[PDB]
Design a protein around this motif. Sequence first.
Motif, PDB file in Angstrom:
ATOM      1  N   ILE A  35       0.790  -1.124  -0.039  1.00 27.82           N
ATOM      2  CA  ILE A  35      -0.078   0.065   0.008  1.00 27.82           C
ATOM      3  C   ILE A  35       0.674   1.202  -0.056  1.00 27.82           C
ATOM      4  CG2 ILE A  35      -1.825   1.424   1.457  1.00 27.82           C
ATOM      5  CD1 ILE A  35      -2.526  -1.477   2.395  1.00 27.82           C
ATOM      6  N   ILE A  36       0.919   2.129  -0.992  1.00 22.70           N
ATOM      7  CA  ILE A  36       1.799   3.101  -0.934  1.00 22.70           C
ATOM      8  C   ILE A  36       1.116   4.645  -0.822  1.00 22.70           C
ATOM      9  CG2 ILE A  36       3.627   1.890  -2.174  1.00 22.70           C
ATOM     10  CD1 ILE A  36       2.511   4.045  -4.531  1.00 22.70           C
ATOM     11  N   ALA A  37      -0.220   4.776  -0.459  1.00 23.49           N
ATOM     12  CA  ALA A  37      -0.965   5.993  -0.373  1.00 23.49           C
ATOM     13  C   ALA A  37      -2.126   5.561   0.004  1.00 23.49           C
ATOM     14  CB  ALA A  37      -0.716   7.043  -1.466  1.00 23.49           C
ATOM     15  N   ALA A  39      -5.834   7.728   0.487  1.00 20.68           N
ATOM     16  CA  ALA A  39      -6.222   9.385   0.533  1.00 20.68           C
ATOM     17  C   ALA A  39      -7.405   9.337  -0.258  1.00 20.68           C
ATOM     18  CB  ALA A  39      -4.971  10.236   0.120  1.00 20.68           C
ATOM     19  N   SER A  40      -8.263  10.507   0.130  1.00 18.33           N
ATOM     20  CA  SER A  40      -9.196  10.656  -0.487  1.00 18.33           C
ATOM     21  C   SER A  40      -8.883  11.240  -1.999  1.00 18.33           C
ATOM     22  CB  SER A  40     -10.319  11.608   0.219  1.00 18.33           C
ATOM     23  OG  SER A  40     -11.537  11.283  -0.246  1.00 18.33           O
ATOM     24  N   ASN A  41      -9.577  10.855  -2.999  1.00 25.40           N
ATOM     25  CA  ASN A  41      -9.196  11.744  -4.447  1.00 25.40           C
ATOM     26  C   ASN A  41      -7.815  11.651  -4.671  1.00 25.40           C
ATOM     27  OD1 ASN A  41     -11.893  12.145  -5.212  1.00 25.40           O
ATOM     28  ND2 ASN A  41     -11.764  13.785  -3.463  1.00 25.40           N
ATOM     29  N   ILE A  42      -7.140  10.506  -5.069  1.00 29.42           N
ATOM     30  CA  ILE A  42      -6.095  10.220  -5.782  1.00 29.42           C
ATOM     31  C   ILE A  42      -6.248  10.263  -7.273  1.00 29.42           C
ATOM     32  CG2 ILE A  42      -4.214   8.766  -5.962  1.00 29.42           C
ATOM     33  CD1 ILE A  42      -4.581   7.613  -3.123  1.00 29.42           C
ATOM     34  N   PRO A  43      -5.574  11.100  -7.876  1.00 27.32           N
ATOM     35  CA  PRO A  43      -5.377  11.433  -9.215  1.00 27.32           C
ATOM     36  C   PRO A  43      -5.295  10.251 -10.131  1.00 27.32           C
ATOM     37  CG  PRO A  43      -3.947  12.874  -8.245  1.00 27.32           C
ATOM     38  CD  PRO A  43      -4.704  12.185  -7.090  1.00 27.32           C
ATOM     39  N   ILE A  46      -1.742   9.687 -11.388  1.00 27.50           N
ATOM     40  CA  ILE A  46      -0.541   9.961 -10.621  1.00 27.50           C
ATOM     41  C   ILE A  46       0.636   9.002 -10.955  1.00 27.50           C
ATOM     42  CG2 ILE A  46      -1.362   8.486  -8.711  1.00 27.50           C
ATOM     43  CD1 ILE A  46       0.337  11.809  -8.637  1.00 27.50           C
ATOM     44  N   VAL A  47       0.350   7.864 -11.336  1.00 27.12           N
ATOM     45  CA  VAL A  47       1.048   6.781 -11.677  1.00 27.12           C
ATOM     46  C   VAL A  47       0.686   6.348 -13.082  1.00 27.12           C
ATOM     47  CG1 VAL A  47       2.336   6.219  -9.710  1.00 27.12           C
ATOM     48  CG2 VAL A  47       0.152   5.079 -10.465  1.00 27.12           C
ATOM     49  N   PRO A 339      -0.299   3.114   4.605  1.00 17.29           N
ATOM     50  CA  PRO A 339       1.026   2.972   3.487  1.00 17.29           C
ATOM     51  C   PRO A 339       1.650   2.305   4.262  1.00 17.29           C
ATOM     52  CG  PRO A 339       0.047   5.281   4.251  1.00 17.29           C
ATOM     53  CD  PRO A 339      -0.684   4.382   4.992  1.00 17.29           C
TER      54      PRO A 339
END
Lengths: 378, 378, 375, 375
Positions: A35-37, A39-43, A46-47, A339
């Motif tokens: 698990i690397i992040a 959060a609410s609303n991850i674009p 992003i990757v 994370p």
Amino acid sequence: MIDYTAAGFTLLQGAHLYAPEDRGICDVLVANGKIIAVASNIPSDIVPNCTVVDLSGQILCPGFIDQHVHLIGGGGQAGPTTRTPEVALSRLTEAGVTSVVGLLGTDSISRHPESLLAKTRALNEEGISAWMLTGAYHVPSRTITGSVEKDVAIIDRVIGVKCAISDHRSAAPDVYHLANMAAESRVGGLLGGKPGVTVFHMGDSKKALQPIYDLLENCDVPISKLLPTHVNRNVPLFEQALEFARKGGTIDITSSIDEPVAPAEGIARAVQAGIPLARVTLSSDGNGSQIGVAGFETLLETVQVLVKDYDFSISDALRPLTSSVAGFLNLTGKGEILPGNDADLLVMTPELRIEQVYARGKLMVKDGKACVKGTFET
Amino acid sequence: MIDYTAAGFTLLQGAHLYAPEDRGICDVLVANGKIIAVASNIPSDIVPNCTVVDLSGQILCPGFIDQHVHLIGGGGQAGPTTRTPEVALSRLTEAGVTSVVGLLGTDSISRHPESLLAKTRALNEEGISAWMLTGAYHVPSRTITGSVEKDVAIIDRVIGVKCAISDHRSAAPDVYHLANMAAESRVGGLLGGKPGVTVFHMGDSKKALQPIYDLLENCDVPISKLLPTHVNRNVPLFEQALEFARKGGTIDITSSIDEPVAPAEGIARAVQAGIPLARVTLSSDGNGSQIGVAGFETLLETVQVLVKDYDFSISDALRPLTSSVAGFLNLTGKGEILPGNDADLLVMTPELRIEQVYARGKLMVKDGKACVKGTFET
Amino acid sequence: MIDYTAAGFTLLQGAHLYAPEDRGICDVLVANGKIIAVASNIPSDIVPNCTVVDLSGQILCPGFIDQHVHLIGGGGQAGPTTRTPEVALSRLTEAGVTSVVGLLGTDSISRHPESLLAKTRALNEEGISAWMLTGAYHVPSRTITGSVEKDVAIIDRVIGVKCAISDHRSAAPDVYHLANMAAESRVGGLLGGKPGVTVFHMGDSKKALQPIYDLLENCDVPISKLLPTHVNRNVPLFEQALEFARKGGTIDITSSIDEPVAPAEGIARAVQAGIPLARVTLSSDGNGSVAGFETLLETVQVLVKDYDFSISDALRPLTSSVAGFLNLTGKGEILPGNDADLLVMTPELRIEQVYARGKLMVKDGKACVKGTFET
Amino acid sequence: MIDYTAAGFTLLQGAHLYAPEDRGICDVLVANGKIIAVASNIPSDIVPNCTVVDLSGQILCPGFIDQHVHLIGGGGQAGPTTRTPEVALSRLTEAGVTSVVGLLGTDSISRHPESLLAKTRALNEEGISAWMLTGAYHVPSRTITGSVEKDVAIIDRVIGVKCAISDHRSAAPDVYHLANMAAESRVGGLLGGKPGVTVFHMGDSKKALQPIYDLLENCDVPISKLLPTHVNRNVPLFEQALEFARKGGTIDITSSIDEPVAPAEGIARAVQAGIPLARVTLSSDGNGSVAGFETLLETVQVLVKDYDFSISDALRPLTSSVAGFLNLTGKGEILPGNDADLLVMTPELRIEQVYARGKLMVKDGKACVKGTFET
Ligand SMILES: [Zn+2]
Ligand SMILES: [Zn+2]
Ligand SMILES: [Zn+2]
Ligand SMILES: [Zn+2]
Ligand SMILES: [Zn+2]
Ligand SMILES: [Zn+2]
Ligand SMILES: [Zn+2]
Ligand SMILES: [Zn+2]
């Protein structure tokens, strides 16, 4: 075109997350099985090469840790035809189990720790996470290296030792033998970086928890290394377990035992008695002999019941199977969605029915059915 | 002409049958060493190639089960010249014994379980049914595989373990050692499908049954797995045995001990004390050292005495040697005349004198004399 | 009404009987799991409470004896995940197998004789007949009691020992170790009333049967106690095998090995080489890595179909020859006094019914009796 | 702001990459200690919270794998005072070593596999990767569980066994003992998913490789599982070594032995002899009696400088060849999916930075990560 597929980037979007802590609607980003992040609303961009998963309307929680399973088979108490068969990967995964602790029982004549060890390794190789306990009901313990301390210290997958007390199937151990064995497990774990626990199969003898108290009077093993299991098997025993928990011990309730104290009932009473959930775990005793063999459906069933008939919050309902277990066995990276933790996750419907299962970031179950099977599953 | 001789059809006609239960005048049809029908008036032509036996005026009962015999020889307590010789087939059969349990005694230095095991097998091969106990007076037990649990679990003919207590010939065992051994026997039997009993040779120590009570306080072995033998050897011991039986234990009376409590007397008192016959057995201690060696005539003698001088019914008189023994050791197919049971039968005169003996449907004794002898009998 | 059902009278009528010997149309009467009469026209009323089965138009023959099965599972040569699962009852019975001999292979670390022994016992309880071999590929042998000689003499189900030679997975045994182990099995066999055989897993090493010959020059164990298996795995080995058989030895062909020498082919060549069928056996190596049991029956079909064998003969390698080699009293032949282990087949050799010890196990080609935990 | 630091994104940009294969100027992206992308011009913003390292003008290559190290100390051949101390982390990393295989030597009385096993584990925890061999010069081998076969199959870090032959410090093993021990390692390797190799310390005896050849004729262990080390210790031995390699074997040259055959020289001759680099390895014998690790890198420098080797090739014996021989998955090559074990060097081959599993261990040629008790 650059290939970033090695990362296995997966974005789990929009579920209501129970870490088990209620985090509300929140996203989870996974890579390399970790698990690397969170959060609410991850674009969603992003990757690169990111697999995006719409979990809108669903629930996301940590995978269950079943610390009491007869991975290579059990039974045998009524002759050789009663030896149950080994556990199949899919059975575990479809049941929401991503981490398991294998062990031996009554029969340590036709069942060997080396066999158990091999099976443990196969399961890790196949996709989930597995450990084991050395010993079996028999005291003195039957081990791999010849010593309980040595087994816990040097065999990577060994985290503690198992035994049986207050049961007509015991080896009639005396306090010294018990004390020594727990002391070896304790020490072996310091050396090996293991929890070094001692798990006690409890039977129906009227003596109940006595031997454990006797033991504590005869040694310096911390109470936190001692785990009585099948505590819901009889009332008087259950009652003593409560006080045991009150004194700082952790108690393990068996999901496969319906009477006289049902599993959800047992957990509810603990709470009523003022015992913190951190000190209560739930395990299946799966693959033992029931003639039928005990399954893993009872785990999920217990969570459902607790929520639906007992007023527990989902968060609370999850503990005994996740954070409390990881907590007790010191299983780093497991039992919680943070994370840096392993990506062992369940995806459920709002009615607590499993749809998908991720083990180490890998999709194992889809649509409630296993898409990754044991090597010999047919 | 069709040959049906392979079946070994034998019809035993018109005796007064004691199953041991009084069945009155009734016929018995045998095939392949098994009882296949028990009924009044079986048509002498119901089966082809049928050997018909007129038992009119005679009595038919089940063959005796002698659970305490020194099959390979015993003695040795007064030096090497006192080592008795092995048991000969004919001695058993002419005595009405169709099933036997072999065991070791004082000497486990010049006597070995492997020898006992071979002898047990020879006897089965020769025509009767035989099992054995591992261990001997010595505690810790001398075994075949290195472990009592392993011996009971894996050696087919091993059904439990023997030991000695309250005797000047004991190994001065402590409670733990005893508890462990009984616990191993118990467990080993679950695994192996054996009764898993522990037989205690009792001596004349004033402590009498104490160790057994101590043991029960230190383990979860059911009282029904524990068998004290030679209980009639002294009064105080006998008296305690009665209460032991009253609490649910089974007691074994030795036919070869005349004083202070004679065998028939012992059985009569049990009944007087309100103990159910199911909890009383009678065994010979045959081939032990008496210098003479104990024989098997005392078995039959006891039945005669009980009937003739004690007012027992023949049915009741038979129990301790048949159904109660089978009952205690779980010897399926033995101790009772029922369809499906083995054809182990005695044919007696109305005055309780043996005329014929059938073991597994085979005529072993005729006219009170053995017609089938041990391989080396001369 | 008198009840005679304890006898389990069963009359199998009208089939074309191969005992394996062709006996034409003949009846078989069974009681208490044993064959009690074999003759044409047995009267349907000869015994009370008799179950009559009309097998007219069908073939009746002895159940198969598979002497090479990894009962508790095998594999593990490519790591932990390759450990196969234990064998289920129905897989055996559906394939015509009513008697079996279990053994271990490469892995004797995660696999134990004690486990194998319990499984053997389980099967006997479940309805078929089973024995085992002690040891495994590893030499010195890993035993139950600590001695090969002792295991064979005292453990009722143990009938011999297994080992591996000429294979990259062997333990590099020397002649002494091999001789001693064979001699212990031999002697234990005598004391325990067992065949006391030594079964050699053959690999592809160029040394082929050499070690056996060497062994023979270094001990006095009879040639008839030594069994090389997998002999059809390579040509030179197969050919050497023919010679060994000619010298008085028995050879075991593996039904699961299709190249370079197919099972039926190997059997045909043995015969064509002058070797009596009595000295040729066929085993599956079932449950190894998961090899199944259908090739057994298929080999029989092929022999008849493509090799000009009569049915009688084609049956031998799986029936009388094995029973004879292992001294399995009461097995491999339909004779009064033998166990009621029988197969019911169509004239084209498809299994319809199977009886083990007189109990109906498979019906209409389907197991109607299953292992305790069979799903 | 969302935190993505748990991934440890690191982008190594602009170096001349030798995978060991020359790949020209190319970028390497790392996450969670693994190489996730290898390509020219990876965008610096392709991932959040990315650490960008400009390596322009530098060389990037795989970390070295030293398969022959006396991790817990060695020596003791001239009495107690000659027992060397255990290896410190920084000595390894500063020398470019990111993967290591520990073993015992002459002394297996004051030195134990259990101690070696703990040290192996310590190192893995400290940041590098380590395995060990069971046994020591002594044959029969002194093991942890009592069996060579069992040690290899069940102890996770054990990958094979060590022994000594043709040396005045050997245990005078006979062929049987050697064969059996090699076969146990072989079989354990299979069950445990390990290479299951046998490593032979070679001494100066005139018998040289004889025992190996003998062994081969006495067992079926593949030639590719047998590794003679110290082959450059004497001429006749070296020459025999070339032949063994030609037959399919792999050979290990000791970087710490400078005469009579220097390390680079030996490597050059092997190649000139027609042996592929894949079958040639280089190890230090570091920490024996205290031999250091600088000769590793020096050998590479010399090959390039004085022997006409390309950099790619000069790297093989310490990278891909070892990983390949020991089946070290994820090691020895810069490929997506492999571990981020990398060296940063100057164009003249001087170590600047070292990453082990993606963690920066050495900076500016100096360890910036040290062993727990490193002073
Ligand atoms: Zn339990
Ligand atoms: Zn359990
Ligand atoms: Zn006695
Ligand atoms: Zn006695
Ligand atoms: Zn094989
Ligand atoms: Zn096989
Ligand atoms: Zn060396
Ligand atoms: Zn060295």
